[PDB]
Symmetry: C4
Subunit: 354 residues, 4 copies
């Protein structure tokens, strides 16, 4: 058998602190979404039917990031969701807006869905997210070429991928960003069901190095549990991070609150779960704790990133990537990194152990 390497993920590594003349409050967190679109902060909500519809994409863009409307609905519904975001108005000085001063929004499509693309363009979507379980596939590559041919000024994101060869193929196909992540999603069983995938830190590292040669941003999609993971993903070279599970428990995410055994929850499920698809399932249907507003979640997450960048001595994301040095740690190191030998009595807003 051919073993190419030993691959690491988030928990395997930590950033080394460096000399710093910058306070966390002073750092700038703007970043590229694609080659032609800027975010005022690096978070994107996942294209999932238990995460991102209009209320969520509105908040995400008001806070300077992006929401991506899921494709588990007919064209007319998705169009209507996009218009709701575009026509939204308010306090949000970091808002992420197009040239008309309208909140930016993204919308998911799948292979061959060219009629959906047409409608979304005419609805004034800012970015189309072309998604497959296997981005490195002929269907995806062909779809990219068709979309760039018909809409040369439409910003196009394609994924998911996990290797440098995939990033090369997509970039040469004409994408404006690649999405990295095969298997690391909280609700994902892809690696278990089919044995395929690449640990997320290594996948991002590999793809970034290739995507850089084309001036193409990488989106790190899936597997983020804590703000520290966001920092690590960015430091390794990603330009933004896509998040589902950390947002699925918010007010704005689709679905109703429910209480079960004294706790509040919302539903969260893979788009490859049996429920969502109504191919063998590559995702599960579950529940996540209720966590209040998107605003409160994003605030804790960005505060973590700001801390990290303060520790590293970085003024902006690009400086963060140039300075960042990692150390690989052991299981015992991870155990020391978490809270240990104390029982938590009041839960912190940015650290929950289940």
């Amino acid at each position: 058998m051919k073993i190419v390497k030993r691959a690491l993920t988030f928990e395997d590594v930590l950033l080394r602190p460096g000399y710093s003349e910058v306070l966390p409050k002073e750092v700038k967190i703007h970043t590229k979404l694609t080659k032609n679109i800027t975010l005022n902060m690096p978070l994107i909500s996942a294209a999932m039917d238990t995460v991102t519809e209009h209320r969520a994409a509105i908040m995400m863009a008001r806070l300077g990031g992006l929401g991506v409307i899921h494709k588990n609905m007919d064209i007319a519904s998705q169009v209507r969701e996009v218009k709701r975001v575009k026509k939204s108005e308010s306090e949000y000085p970091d808002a992420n807006k197009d040239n008309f001063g309208r909140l930016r929004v993204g919308a998911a499509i799948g292979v061959g869905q060219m009629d959906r693309v047409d409608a979304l363009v005419e609805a004034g979507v800012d970015v189309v997210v072309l998604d497959s379980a296997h981005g490195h596939s002929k269907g995806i590559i062909d779809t990219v070429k068709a979309i760039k041919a018909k809409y040369p000024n439409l910003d196009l994101i394609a994924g998911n991928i996990a290797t440098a060869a995939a990033a090369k193929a997509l970039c040469e196909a004409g994408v404006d960003a690649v999405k990295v992540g095969i298997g690391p999603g909280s609700i994902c069983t892809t690696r278990i069901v089919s044995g395929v995938g690449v640990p997320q830190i290594s996948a991002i590292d590999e793809c970034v190095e290739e995507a850089n040669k084309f001036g193409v941003p990488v989106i790190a999609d899936g597997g983020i549990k804590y703000s520290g993971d966001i920092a690590k993903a960015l430091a390794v070279g990603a330009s933004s991070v896509m998040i589902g599970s950390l947002l699925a428990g918010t007010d704005e995410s689709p679905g109703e609150l429910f209480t079960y055994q004294g706790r509040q929850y919302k539903s969260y499920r893979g788009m490859g779960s049996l429920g969502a698809m109504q191919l063998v399932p590559e995702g599960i249907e579950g529940r996540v704790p209720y966590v209040g507003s998107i605003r409160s979640v994003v605030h804790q997450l960005l505060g973590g990133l700001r801390s990290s960048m303060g520790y590293v001595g970085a003024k902006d994301i690009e400086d963060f990537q140039k300075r960042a040095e990692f150390v690989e740690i052991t299981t015992a190191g991870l155990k020391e990194s978490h809270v240990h030998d104390v029982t938590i009595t009041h839960e912190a807003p940015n650290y929950k152990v289940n």
Copy 2:
């Protein structure tokens, strides 16, 4: 001390995705059981008294695979089981059949059991599976030589082994397939009791490299918990996979269904457990959740396999093995690979925790 390598198993590795032009529904999954016997799908039910009798064996063959009738019964009883399969009769277009249109079946034998082989050969058995806890032994090798001498056109599988040296010995003795696995079985305590074994992925890899020289296919036997493990075993170069615990919960497996504290189960035990031997055991007696029909289980398992081959861009298994690249992962990598940070509310058909 002499340490020859760091040895890996299923949970230590993942397959890298590759450029694909094939959809999962389009890939071909036929394979080889032995030099001369073909499978339409690569699964074999284990030769265990809680897994394979005639009902399981019939379903496995109708679906394109194979069942091996266990040997924890007298010769006559086993002859009868084999006969029920061979006499069995669009609905099963992938049925694995012999030149007469009869379902194929295998039967297990032990060292020096030529009387059992005689009666099985007479009963129309398609393949004989020579089983020992230690396939790399004088007893096993002599039995091989004697069987091939007396029945030269009888397909012979022997095991279990875990080293290239063992593979070489068996191939030179004249086997038509080798079975790999010392200690990975769900119900197995061999490694703990005797301190002996080789993590299943490295074992398959080592033995495939040796047996390939002789044109001898390798059966990966034991340690499969998920469809993804089937894919890995095949990608590393196994030609087929033998499965126990995943099928012991099925309607067709021997034994009755029972309910305990709100959950349904069937029994499952090692053939070296106390119960099965009736003494220093190398297996345990336990229970597995009821999972309904073998059909539904096989469907999900082949689903994952096809999906894997789609991800690798492999049109068939030879191509899969050719293209397959692995990456070694850490404990944190395994944790990320499983479902994490979400509570499952509706369990999936092909993923249980």
Copy 3:
């Protein structure tokens, strides 16, 4: 990406035994706090509002160590705490005292707090501990320069750091000790929240190699759970150890004792927790078991240290560091090192699970 090393912590290593001619009762455990301040035993209580006020500080000093009064209070209050220690009065023959026979005490300060330093220096403080979550910063380094300029004979400790580069910066700025530890603290979430830190053993090792060039002692701060960790920290070359969770359960720590579900506790929280800050926290609020007096805790901890030095054959700490050889262990090695395969019925004074 740039990975500079595989970094280890306490549970990754063990000390090898060596030829010994010393019994544990015979070894000497005096050490250095700073270039100019001496300790009779090497423990310092953490500068936390659930660990060190005047009661703890007095006990730590009477036993030959030191307490650092925390800074989560106004300047006046902290001046008063420091004053209660300095005014405090065979029973304590190892008492750590200044040239006037007064117990020694330290006090914590933050970046740009020269007013606090002024009032502490006036109150007779023996050492000032300059604390920041990130000691390798322009703020900390400028504060050092300003303090040493204004009070050149005032012993100054600064931290926290975890790299040789940080150690070098601080030593050149003029500190009398560096404090090492980014993220190992029991109540600390820094590593999870910001992704930043260095496993404590490698951190100490890196910083000791740098600071030693300047004659500057290293304080290992955070992550101690057992006496054995104290030994390792010292053997790697720390001159002293700062301890939080192990002392938060004591009579003398601030806060009241309470009972919850049959067990006794006191509160313990990070100075960067929400509660202590009153916002994006880097600590948590929790509880630790009540453990009785500081004396009894320190007794057990120094017991393990002396035992360690006996095992290594070290007559004193310099000798310990000289002789110490480590071995790196695996997860299975750690499991064997703990109590295993037996249920504890009467808990030990110095081992809790």
Copy 4:
């Protein structure tokens, strides 16, 4: 810091099966206890007050191994325990006997206990086990030299040690066997309390290589949980294994049976536990499950060893050591080695997971 090596213990390694012309029933398991004393099988019960008094040492020797009477009693009591074993009579054809046809027995002593040694010699003890928490110490080395000087034909065992230099010092001191094990005992907190110790497989490996140059057997003392560990310890080069926890729950071991929450137990405690010593404790006081007779325990343990040797192709222990090849495994390998993905319904006599 100086890191000499990465050290492995039992769970880190497995034996490779080899070509075999031998059945488990056919293999011979006799071994050297010391340079001048043979065991018919390689097990020794631990010198502990909750393991080995006369009833236990009698059974151990009848089965061909050895019991070592603990030293937590006055001289007269220990002498009387030794005589009880020596005067025992019975069915036990593998019995381990001196030249007078009396069951062999060993007795523990500590540094300087020369009067106890005299009494034990006069009681007809076969081997004296000189024990310290730190065998590589001047007190121990001096005691060895004094005992060999006064009783040149008395077989003398000394420990505990964990390094090649220790084995060299003891061998040159004149011992007839060295005992290896600092920290691996089930009830031991030495490694936690003082940070000192060496993972047991590495310790045995290191000491055996040194002890061999003197023709001195190594005893592997502590950390055995399963029969597989016995095989591994022997394959690495040890001549016998000392066991406490696996025997503490037997009829013959000191102490009464008790029932707590529907289970039967016996007490088991470190000799460095607070209870036993009545220095900071380096052991705990606990309980272990009741397991019936020593005969039934030893039978399962020896059957495991016989299997192992059958797998390796070994006719006797020395052949076992020459043939044995190990492979290092991962955490996932260990997980696969144990029972997994099945719930046990009838507990096996040689495999219990708690």
